[PDB]
Design a protein around this nucleic acid. Structure first.
Lengths: 119, 104, 122, 22
RNA sequence: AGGGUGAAAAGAACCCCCAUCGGGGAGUGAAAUAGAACAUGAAACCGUAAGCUCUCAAGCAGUGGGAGGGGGACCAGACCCUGACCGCGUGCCUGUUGAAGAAUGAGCCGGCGACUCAUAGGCAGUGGCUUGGUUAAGGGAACCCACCGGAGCCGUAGCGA
RNA sequence: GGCCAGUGAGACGAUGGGGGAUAAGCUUCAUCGUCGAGAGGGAAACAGCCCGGAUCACCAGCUAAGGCCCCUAAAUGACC
RNA sequence: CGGUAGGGGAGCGUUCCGUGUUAGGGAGAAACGCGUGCGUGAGCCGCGUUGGACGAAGCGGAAGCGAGAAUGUCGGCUUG
């Protein structure tokens, strides 16, 4: 059955898959199949890294402080630290706000003396 | 000033002089001023720490820079057991802020 | 690309050849004609008349002196091939192809800017 | 009286619409 | 197997290199980055040039975080292109209770290639009419397949051999 | 009740019984759950075991199972 | 609001035709890039370059309606 002639139609269905493939190391950007198995990866992993992006930092923040705990005095855990604020009443200074360690370590030094007084 | 406001579920340490792509602010129109008295941390010399939720005095002031979904990230997924390829674009007005007043 | 002269449908190849032009690249019009006449490769022709083809003409056709000439661009490309057939065993594992070449080089003056300066008190 | 703005808006048939679903 | 340079070919004198094959100029034409492989001429494939990464680093190698470098920014406001390194991480499809594979099909690309059509019947949506509804052949001064034709079929009473 | 289906060689774990030596992710039935037609977290890596069962974004918090010397976040915390 | 086979409910695009010698085009289709804005998506719109001719907005109608695998078919082109 003489189709309606794919012509340019089936031409756009492949090049569009190539435009997306313009930053890959391997030859997964110069073939519909090599990219077919490539896009799916960036089609599944993408659906993951999007939710993993939050977890990826969940360990970071804790690690950021962890490296800052092995110097002060509370060699115990940063948990007791969080416990102090919890039992206290500070809904601030979150895992993200833990950036006070690196820059201006003078502010993060105050809470260090406020956690001991509470507990 | 080290301020910790609330976007509804997010609490960044938005340092004065930088913008933050907040969520949707139906209460605030384009090029409108917004105030969040829900700030927790405060600069002023030593990092002050209030007791009861949020702060009782002072607040944050700034002006939104128009709302828009910026760039359609277009999230998606995939399955092996069965060919299931679908694409969906997420809007998110990512309303940016501003602020400038900085302090220790 | 000032002057580009050569040809096509050469009886040479694309693999064995080219390896000769990759040595004359970035070389003057002389340093290239003093090496080809020593290259025991067939590719030396008609590539020999090539370096001479790109030159000479660019001397009376355009304003380019014999000197300061250097091979700017040079590359060998495969043209049209012929599908030949050669018996061997029931005739099956055959295709045959004659990788022809039609290189196209170009010559042009050289930049460079020297201006030595010294002081001589007397 | 037609508005000289290149774009008439009379009222003929244009389309016979659809006829049921499915 | 193999289609068309252009409107008319004026389809290329002469000049230069070569073995008086081939090419480049000079000219013709609105075009020859249209000239006899010639129209528009993508992809697979095959190269040059430029920026970045690249010898102590390994596993379908992308992705998330992410320094530096070559450029482009705004009379800071920390962004647009490449990417060291790092956390995870065993193609697709088919067939199966179950595989990434030692399960199988596929070298790549362009084109091409698999539930359409006729008649009839039973439903669903919708439309005209209505216990009525509706024709088939045929005729037709037919801008026209209308009109006429209701021969015939279906339904409102059934049940029983 | 009516229109269109699909599928009839499924597997595994717990529990209650026939086959085998109460030997097998072996085979043949009943019941529940999972895989098979739902990822992910945990058991190093093991679909079927455990927790929980994914509209989506988010440098947002708290938990389940499983853990907390380092390697991948988390007690070489206290008492016997 | 995970989802296979399946069932049901909504649309895009392609060739052609009716509504079109109306309108857009030599101050110019087609082929490639880009604006990475827009829609749930397949895509659409605008535009630069190249290039050479027509093509076609909207609704509906009629389709031989878009495949990277059936040891496919034809042609061209890699690798050993």
């Amino acid at each position: 059955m003489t189709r309606v002639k794919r012509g340019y139609i089936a031409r756009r269905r492949r090049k569009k898959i190539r435009f997306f493939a313009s930053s890959f190391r391997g030859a997964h950007s110069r073939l519909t199949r090599t990219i077919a198995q490539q896009k799916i990866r960036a089609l599944v992993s993408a659906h993951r890294d999007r939710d993993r992006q939050k977890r990826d930092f969940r360990r970071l923040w804790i690690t950021r402080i962890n490296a800052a705990i092995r110097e002060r005095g509370v060699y115990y855990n940063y948990s007791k630290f969080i416990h102090d604020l919890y039992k206290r009443q500070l809904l601030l200074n979150r895992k993200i706000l833990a950036q006070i360690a690196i820059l201006n370590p003078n502010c993060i030094y105050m809470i260090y003396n406020e956690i001991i007084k509470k507990e | 000033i080290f301020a910790v406001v609330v976007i509804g579920s997010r609490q960044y340490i938005v340092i004065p002089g930088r913008w933050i792509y907040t969520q949707r602010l139906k209460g605030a129109t384009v090029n409108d001023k917004i105030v969040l008295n829900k700030v927790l941390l405060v600069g002023t010399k030593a990092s002050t720490y209030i007791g009861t939720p949020i702060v009782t005095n002072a607040a944050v002031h700034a002006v939104v820079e128009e709302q828009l979904l910026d760039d359609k990230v277009i999230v998606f997924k995939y399955k092996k057991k069965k060919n299931y390829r679908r694409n969906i674009g997420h809007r998110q007005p990512i309303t940016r802020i501003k602020i400038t007043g900085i302090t220790g | 690309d000032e002057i580009t002269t050569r040809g096509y449908s050469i009886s040479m190849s694309v693999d064995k050849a080219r390896r000769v032009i990759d040595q004359i690249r970035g070389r003057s019009y002389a340093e290239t004609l003093m090496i080809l006449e020593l290259m025991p490769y067939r590719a030396c022709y008609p590539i020999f008349k090539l370096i001479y083809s790109a030159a000479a003409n660019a001397s009376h056709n355009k304003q380019f002196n014999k000197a300061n000439l250097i091979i700017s661009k040079a590359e060998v490309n495969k043209g049209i091939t012929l599908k030949k057939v050669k018996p061997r065993a029931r005739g099956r594992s055959y295709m045959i192809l004659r990788p022809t070449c039609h290189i196209t080089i170009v010559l042009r003056d050289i930049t460079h800017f020297d201006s030595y300066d010294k002081f001589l008190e007397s | 009286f037609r508005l000289d703005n290149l774009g008439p808006q009379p009222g003929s048939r244009k389309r016979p619409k659809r006829k049921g679903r499915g």
